[PDB]
């Protein structure tokens, strides 16, 4: 007999409280009652992504909230680790602190990167400066092809678009009332940037570290007997090295 | 894997995803304004930013309506509206022949600009505090002498 | 170096599996070294081979991976690993060699396992002679090929 | 770092942690405070003033105040209001050459 369930059905968090992450241990200790059985669990990266050093803080804001000795020790160990832990078992692994791992990744996955261009008004390559806050055919000749109308056209009309330039007021602004018929983020740069920043910060603030109890419940299933657990994934390199350690999830297929 | 920092500003600090500071984005916005106004335009093919066909039609409609008001209440109509909305359907065809761009300059650099005159230009550096940033954040105000109002400007931003 | 209790118990399990793969029941120390090498190479090929890309395995039968790994491509790997180990031996005060190997997990690279002492430079020191010796050892393989 | 090198007779990565610190200070010597002779007097057409830590998404530790690196930041006066910040135009890579050459002269002396 086989039991199958998906992991996305348990990444439900609200108020920084992950409800499903104990629903999962409850279903685990229920699996532990119907031996012998196979338990499938797919897309585990949904509950297994990397829990989040920076020199940009002492460069521009000047915090320097650290004794010089601990910083010096960090520098020593960082250099030695970058240079001498290349391809050493359990000391040198899925580690972003080593540049040669990133070189290998970009060598096999990506396609050949090119040099800089000889143009002007571009950055280094044939492109423009990129946004500060992140929110088959041969020619172009084959690429030129009451309630609902009003409501949803004006619904598409007012949404915040990040790639719109910004309008400019006449130095003698629109008279009173008319200024209130205009969405503020369409003629004011301060307003548009404030809105984008609030969006970005809010969408980042949804971290809610859940790795530790997932780890303890994974360690929980070796005290049982007579069943097996398959955890299928798609991006095994973006998983946090807390799981890939021997005893948790290392037998790979 | 070594970048040599070619076209950009020398020391720029991070942005809201990382640092909650909003100055680099405020300057990027004006960079994009400059790109649209001077180098590229709104679409492929245009010489610069242009007065759209919709805006021309709207000037026409406003003048017509004010004229009909001033003539009817102080005293060849439906055909006009019909064929006028006929043209309105084009609009998105890139290949319309527009011979001149003087109206864009007259409407955007003369009527929105140097027709007028902004009078808050500069200030002497010696204020009641050691700064304009401190004078502005002060608790009362320091911009009142007849008790005229003596304003100091905001700082100018350079983005090169 | 750098292992703990969980590491060594998982190592014993993977070592038993590696000893099975050679038709034995008793775990030898060679099976432990093979387990270390296996973990390392699997980790590196999981990072290289991902959603697509790939191009590093050599035993899958798919259009990517030829089945027997032609002989002219085995002579080269052996020459590579031999040059690297030879240069790491004649270099004064380099690390010590524990196990040289070719074609681990069928990938087309070698693997030399180095035993090093954590008490000559306590996880923190790098002298100039050591860095120059490392540079020479890392160019030796290409130069011998 | 220079003491370790003069005892052993050979370079190390200890220097790696020294010069980093020194470089920061040396730049603050040349650009922000105006002590050098970069121009005939030491006045330079561009400097990078610090921002307050209030902008960073910050945390709090139970530590003591650092001896030098954080007690010398009592003399800085960062910028706190965003619409009164001054950044001059960046230099021209022929002027940056000469300014960073002044940084080098300081460090070498």
């Amino acid at each position: 007999k086989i039991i199958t369930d998906n992991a996305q059905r348990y990444a439900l968090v609200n108020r920084g409280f992950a409800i499903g992450i104990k629903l999962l241990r409850e279903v685990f200790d229920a699996i532990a009652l119907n031996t012998p059985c196979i338990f499938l669990l797919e897309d585990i990266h949904a509950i297994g992504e990397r829990r989040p050093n920076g020199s940009f803080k002492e460069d521009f804001f000047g915090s320097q909230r650290d004794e010089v000795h601990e910083k010096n020790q960090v520098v020593y160990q960082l250099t030695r680790h970058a240079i001498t832990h290349y391809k050493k078992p359990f000391k040198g692994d899925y580690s972003l602190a080593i540049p040669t791992n990133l070189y290998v990744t970009d060598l096999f996955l990506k396609l050949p990167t090119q040099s800089i261009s000889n143009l002007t008004n571009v950055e280094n390559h044939n492109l423009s400066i990129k946004n500060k806050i992140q929110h088959n055919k041969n020619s172009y000749l084959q690429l030129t092809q009451t309630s609902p109308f009003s409501v949803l056209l004006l619904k598409e009309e007012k949404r915040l678009k990040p790639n719109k330039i910004v309008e400019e007021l006449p130095w003698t602004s629109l008279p009173g009332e008319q200024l209130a018929t205009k969405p503020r983020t369409s003629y004011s740069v301060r307003a548009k940037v404030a809105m984008l920043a609030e969006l970005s910060l809010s969408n980042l603030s949804a971290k809610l570290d859940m790795i530790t109890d997932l780890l303890v419940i994974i360690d929980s299933v070796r005290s049982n007997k007579g069943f097996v657990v398959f955890a299928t994934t798609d991006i095994p390199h973006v998983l946090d090295p807390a799981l890939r350690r021997p005893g948790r999830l290392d037998e790979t297929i | 894997l070594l970048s040599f920092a070619d076209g950009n500003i020398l020391d720029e600090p991070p942005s809201p995803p990382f640092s909650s500071l909003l100055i680099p984005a405020k300057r990027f916005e004006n960079y994009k304004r400059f790109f649209r106004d001077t180098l590229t335009g709104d679409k492929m093919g245009q010489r610069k930013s242009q007065i759209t066909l919709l805006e021309k039609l709207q000037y026409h409609m406003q003048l017509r309506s004010i004229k009909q008001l001033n003539a009817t209440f102080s005293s060849n109509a439906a055909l006009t509206s019909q064929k006028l909305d006929t043209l309105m359907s084009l609009s998105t065809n890139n290949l319309l022949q527009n011979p001149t761009n003087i109206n864009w300059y007259y409407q955007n650099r003369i009527l929105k600009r140097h027709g007028q005159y902004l009078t808050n230009q500069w200030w002497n550096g010696q204020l009641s505090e050691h700064n304009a940033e401190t004078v502005f954040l002060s608790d009362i105000d320091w911009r009142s002498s007849l008790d005229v109002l003596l304003d100091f400007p905001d700082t100018d931003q350079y983005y090169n | 170096a750098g292992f703990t209790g969980a590491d060594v118990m998982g190592l014993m399990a993977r070592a038993a599996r590696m000893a099975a793969r050679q038709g034995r029941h008793a775990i030898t120390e060679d099976d432990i070294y093979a387990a270390m090498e296996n973990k390392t190479m699997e980790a590196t090929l999981e990072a290289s081979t991902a959603g697509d890309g790939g191009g590093l395995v050599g035993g899958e039968g798919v259009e990517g991976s030829p089945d027997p790994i032609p002989p002219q491509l085995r002579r080269a790997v052996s020459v590579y690993e031999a040059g690297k180990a030879l240069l790491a031996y004649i270099t004064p005060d380099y690390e010590e060699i524990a196990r040289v190997s070719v074609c681990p997990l069928n990938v087309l690279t070698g693997f030399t396992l180095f035993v090093e002492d954590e008490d000559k430079n306590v996880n923190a020191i790098l002298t100039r002679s050591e860095l120059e010796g490392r540079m020479v050892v890392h160019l030796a393989g290409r130069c011998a090929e | 770092g220079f003491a370790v090198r003069t005892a052993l007779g050979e370079e190390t990565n200890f220097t790696a942690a020294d010069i980093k610190r020194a470089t920061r200070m040396a730049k603050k010597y040349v650009f922000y405070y105006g002590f050098s002779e970069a121009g005939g007097a030491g006045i330079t057409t561009w400097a990078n003033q610090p921002y307050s830590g209030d902008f960073v998404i910050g945390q709090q530790r139970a530590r003591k105040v650092v001896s030098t690196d954080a007690m010398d930041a009592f003399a800085d006066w960062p910028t706190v209001s965003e619409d009164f910040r001054f950044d001059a135009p960046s230099p021209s890579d022929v002027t940056w050459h000469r300014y960073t050459d002044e940084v080098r002269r300081v460090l070498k002396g």
Binding site: L96, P99, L102, D106, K110, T113, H125 | L1, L2, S3, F4, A5, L10 | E132, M135, V136, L139 | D93, W96, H97, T100
Partner: peptide
């Protein structure tokens, strides 16, 4: 997290010299 790991804002004539020195180290090795 094109892909770059290191950045540097040094002048072009100093970049010349530093890269020449890296190259001669590699030649000797």
């Amino acid at each position: 997290s094109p892909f770059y790991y290191h950045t540097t804002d040094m002048s072009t004539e100093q970049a010349r010299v530093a890269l020449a020195e890296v190259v001669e180290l590699l030649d000797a090795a």
